[PDB]
Amino acid sequence: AFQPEFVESISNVSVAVGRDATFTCHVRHLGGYRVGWLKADTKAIQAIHENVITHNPRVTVSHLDQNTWNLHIKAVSEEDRGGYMCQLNTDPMKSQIGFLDVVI
Amino acid sequence: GSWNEPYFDLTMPRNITSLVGKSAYLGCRVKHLGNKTVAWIRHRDLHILTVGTYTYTTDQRFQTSYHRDIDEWTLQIKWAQQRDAGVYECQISTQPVRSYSVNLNIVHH
Ligand SMILES: *[C@@H]1O[C@H](CO[C@@H]2O[C@@H](C)[C@@H](O)[C@@H](O)[C@@H]2O)[C@@H](O[C@@H]2O[C@H](CO)[C@@H](O[C@@H]3O[C@H](CO)[C@@H](O)[C@H](O[C@H]4O[C@H](CO)[C@@H](O)[C@H](O)[C@@H]4O)[C@@H]3O)[C@H](O)[C@H]2NC(C)=O)[C@H](O[C@@H]2O[C@@H](C)[C@@H](O)[C@@H](O)[C@@H]2O)[C@H]1NC(C)=O
Ligand SMILES: *[C@@H]1O[C@H](CO[C@@H]2O[C@@H](C)[C@@H](O)[C@@H](O)[C@@H]2O)[C@@H](O[C@@H]2O[C@H](CO)[C@@H](O[C@@H]3O[C@H](CO)[C@@H](O)[C@H](O[C@H]4O[C@H](CO)[C@@H](O)[C@H](O)[C@@H]4O)[C@@H]3O)[C@H](O)[C@H]2NC(C)=O)[C@H](O[C@@H]2O[C@@H](C)[C@@H](O)[C@@H](O)[C@@H]2O)[C@H]1NC(C)=O
Ligand SMILES: *[C@@H]1O[C@H](CO[C@@H]2O[C@@H](C)[C@@H](O)[C@@H](O)[C@@H]2O)[C@@H](O[C@@H]2O[C@H](CO)[C@@H](O)[C@H](O)[C@H]2NC(C)=O)[C@H](O[C@@H]2O[C@@H](C)[C@@H](O)[C@@H](O)[C@@H]2O)[C@H]1NC(C)=O
């Protein structure tokens, strides 16, 4: 089983209102599997792989390499506070959550 | 007509019961979808299942079909098991998100 696995916990983020935030999901052996992002308290899907799903215009994604998958939140507001889940479509699914703190 | 944001058919059943070993069908009807997508998500672990007719999960029992005549996005859980019981959400990718939650019971008899 050369299955995907998380390399380390998603770091939490503390960011002042109006500045930009980045969450990074660090994985190994991703292979053909795909990284999804969702907001844990609203359950809103943010992105899968290179495709943003939410119509929140402040949300983008990127990857530095196959091991390093980013969710970007521009110009953060108070409503962005809460958990952001990185998810892998393994069977069974694997997930980790990092938390956004918005300071005024 | 005038551009509208999407909305759910609020008469769709929200409590569904289906048989072990048979397909379970969870229905969601979205009007005026426009450029949004309709996703199905499993509440117990927040696992994304389908976005439109794309299947994200690699549990190959899940498949979402679009029935254009009734604007319905129907999640099929093939060969459903008791562990599949629980709440699933149909989700429109507006900001904020719009959700229609459907409970699924899986029984033998
Ligand atoms: C990112 O932050 C997470 C928490 O964020 C806060 O909480 C959430 C809900 C939200 O409100 C945020 O805004 C907050 O900032 C971290 O996860 C937490 O980690 C701690 C561990 O440091 C967990 O704690 C445990 O809680 C248990 C009950 O809930 C206790 O039983 C347990 O006590 C036992 O163990 C400790 C040793 O850890 C002993 O000292 C005790 O005596 C006792 O034996 C802990 O106190 C907490 O539950 C976690 N919260 C959640 C929601 O998971 C997260 O830390 C990462 O995740 C956890 C699971 C561990 O793997 C950490 O090692 C890991 O780093 C932060 N992430 C990072 C990268 O720091
Ligand atoms: C229906 O949705 C289409 C898809 O939306 C995108 O994808 C979905 C999944 C979701 O992620 C949405 O949030 C996305 O926007 C719309 O087409 C896209 O429109 C956006 C703009 O709304 C386009 O984007 C911009 O493209 C510019 C270059 O052409 C960039 O300069 C720009 O960057 C700036 O803007 C963003 C704000 O979004 C800031 O955050 C940045 O900081 C930066 O300042 C964006 O990249 C995107 O290119 C479009 N997609 C495609 C495939 O063309 C569609 O929007 C309609 O059509 C587009 C072409 C525009 O004319 C819109 O004004 C127009 O409404 C939606 N349709 C309707 C009717 O709403
Ligand atoms: C949601 O549906 C559950 C089961 O399906 C229903 O039962 C069939 C007889 C039929 O009505 C079908 O159309 C329905 O979809 C209900 O749970 C069942 O409740 C019966 C008693 O009514 C009980 O004997 C069963 O054990 C139980 N089945 C399961 C799998 O739990 C739900 O009812 C709620 O939950 C029950 C446990 C009970 O507390 C009841 O009073 C509750 O209303 C249905 N939920 C709702 C909100 O309607």
Author numbering:
A (entry chain B): 39 to 142
B (entry chain A): 48 to 156
What do the paper's sentences say?
We have recently identified interactions between two groups of Drosophila IgSF (immunoglobulin superfamily) cell adhesion molecules with properties closely matching a neuronal chemoaffinity function: 21 Dpr proteins, named after the founding member Defective proboscis extension response, selectively bind nine proteins, now called the Dpr-interacting proteins, or DIPs. All 21 Dprs and nine DIPs are predicted to contain two and three immunoglobulin (IG) domains, respectively. Our previous work identified the first IG domains, termed IG1, as the domains mediating the Dpr–DIP interaction by the formation of a pseudo-symmetric IG1-IG1 heterocomplex using the GFCC’C’ face of the immunoglobulin fold. Therefore, Dprs and DIPs are strong candidates for a synapse specification or targeting function.
